[PDB]
Amino acid sequence: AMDAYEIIQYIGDAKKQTLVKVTLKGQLKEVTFPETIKVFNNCKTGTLFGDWADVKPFLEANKEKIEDYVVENDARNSAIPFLDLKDINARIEPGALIREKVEIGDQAVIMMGAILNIGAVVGAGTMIDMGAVLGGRATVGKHCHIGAGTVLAGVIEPPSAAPVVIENEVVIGANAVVLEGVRVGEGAVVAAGAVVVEDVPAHTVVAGVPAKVIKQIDD
Amino acid sequence: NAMDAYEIIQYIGDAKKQTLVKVTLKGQLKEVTFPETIKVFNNCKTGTLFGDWADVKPFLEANKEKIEDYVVENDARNSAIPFLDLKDINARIEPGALIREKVEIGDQAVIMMGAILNIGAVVGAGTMIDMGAVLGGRATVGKHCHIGAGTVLAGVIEPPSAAPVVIENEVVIGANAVVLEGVRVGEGAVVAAGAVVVEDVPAHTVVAGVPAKVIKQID
Amino acid sequence: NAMDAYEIIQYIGDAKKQTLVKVTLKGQLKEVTFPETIKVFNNCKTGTLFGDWADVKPFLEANKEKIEDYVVENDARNSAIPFLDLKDINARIEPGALIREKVEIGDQAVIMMGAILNIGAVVGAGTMIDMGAVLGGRATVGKHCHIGAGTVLAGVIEPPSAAPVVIENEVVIGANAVVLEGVRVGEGAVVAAGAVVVEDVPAHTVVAGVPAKVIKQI
Ligand SMILES: [Cl-]
Ligand SMILES: [Cl-]
Ligand SMILES: [Cl-]
Ligand SMILES: [Cl-]
Ligand SMILES: [Cl-]
Ligand SMILES: [Cl-]
Ligand SMILES: [Mg+2]
Secondary structure (H helix, E strand, C coil): CHHHHHHHHHHHHHHCEEEEEEEEEEECCCCCCCCCCCEECCCCCCEEEHHHHHHHHHHHHHHCCCEEEEEEEEEECCCCCCCCCCCCCCEECCCEEEEEEEEECCCEEEECCCCEECCCCCCCCCEEEECCCCCCCCCECCCCCEEEEEECCCCCCCCCCCEEEECCCEEEEECEECCCCCCCCCEEEECCEEEEEEECCCCCCECCCCCEEEEEEEC | CHHHHHHHHHHHHCCCCCCCEEEEEECCCCCCCCCCCCEECCCEEEEEEEEHHHHHHHHHCCCCCCCCEEEEEEECEECCEEEEECCCCCCCCCCCCCCEEECCEEEEEEEEECCCCCCCCCCCCCCEEECCCECCCCCCEEECEEECCCEECCCCCCCCCCCCCEEEEEEEEECEECCCCEEEECCCCCCCCCCEECCCEEECHHHHHHHEEEEEECC | CCHHHHHHHHHHHHHEEEEEEEEEEEEEEHHHCCCCCCEEEECCCCEEEEEHHHHHHHHHHHHCCCEEEEEEEEEEEECCCEEEECCCCCEEEEECCCEEECCEEEEEEEECCCCCCCCCCCECCCCCECCCEECCCCCCCCCCEECCCCCCEECCCCCCCCCCCEEECCCCCCCCCEEEECEEEECCEEEECCCEECCCCCCCCCEECCCCEEEEEE
């Protein structure tokens, strides 16, 4: 019941960071590393992991002992961590971007380049296809197919607001959009390129910008 | 050739699911025995391991006494299909493009940032696949086409007898368009931004709309 | 600056294509001579190399009898345009955003995961570029805008005399919309989800549809 409130609380607690991986060489036994940097070094070479705010002044301080370095970096002032994928009972392909507090059901499939925002829920056996986007709290049922490039609009604030809810066995075409708070009924089909602005009854096909009922199917 | 779609499904059935990790660690490593299943680049002090999580996890547990600290880097979970080795291809592929094995990239093609090429996709000579575009399984693009940003060319892996999307030479497709399964877009045709193409496009015609219709013949 | 578009094209023509690799290797490395074209971090046993594949590939072959094993990491092929250093920017850029050099990101802008910013793109102060959105070459967004997930703002690199997409302040654009080349969206306008904007949008109007039309004055 308090999920949406606890998401906003988690976000407000999250600490902005600019995490870097540094490879370096030099007279590293002469170097003094602070507790703030995770360091993996021998006397000759090393690998450092840490926030740029700690690493930058560190490199400046030891410039005379460090011969050369490379800094790798992916993000800036980013607070929300990404989800640990290593133990999930599902399939997540490389280039998928999944934030913390996302729920991925058993034997779901998250394709290359899909993006799952905080609070997103993916039911068991569901495919989120390539480049698809699940906004904050967007909720997908079981054995659904969310087409390549489709956007399910996000709803973080206000926490009392209903997120997008995709019921079971839904197929949504490529590059469609489902707007905030819209419910797509069980077994329904949303055509490629549709913009779904109101609830879709179970077992109907909708299509168009904006989507209209085009057909009622018998399963 | 004629067996290509069959050979794709066979390659996928043969692919082994893996949770590849990169581990940076330190400790008493001369006292550590690494198993055959892990690639390891170490001194007696620090080191880097590449392996499947199913091997690396029980390893890290088995050697907890000797391992002082570690970091695990991971991108994918239970992913079976390898990505394409880009290094020797006679084309341009920008960072963030996600390209699976068994994709065919013609001479002097350009694959922009964030484009996603699924297994079996074919990109002809001189073609640009623009930012965030998606080529589904077996989607075939001719020579000197421009596939606009965010465009989805629908995938057809199964059944193998099904025709894929075929884009003929010199076609330009607008941003965030969709071409549905098995559709042929004729030579020199133009597809407007945001169109959903549901049936074959004649050569040298412009189509537009959701669903797309013929809007003018080009001379 | 009046020269901006010309200078972007100059910068591209000057960028050198590269196939950058990171190589982890092990072997008898004290016996190896690493050329000055490769950045090298090694002890006698193991090392890390950074360099262009054109230099690293014949180096690996020349030294195969000394190198026991290696792993090559690579991201790109024949890529010339560098990416933007994010580290000192006064803004928020999330992981997986792809942002080229000569992109301007204003104070407390937000660049969400998977957004794509091409060379010349300008993002104004307090503007959000949402997940999966694409700013084409020279696309210009004002202050306190919201560019919705999956939206494409069309690019204009050549000809340099052509106007880019210009989004004025306080604009909201819905998900998976498209703004075509040279189109100006007026202050405080709303573009509906899925719209294709083919012509200028008046300030404080709502436009919708494929092609977009005025549906409301706000
Ligand atoms: Cl797959
Ligand atoms: Cl969101
Ligand atoms: Cl380019
Ligand atoms: Cl596909
Ligand atoms: Cl955020
Ligand atoms: Cl562009
Ligand atoms: Mg997209």
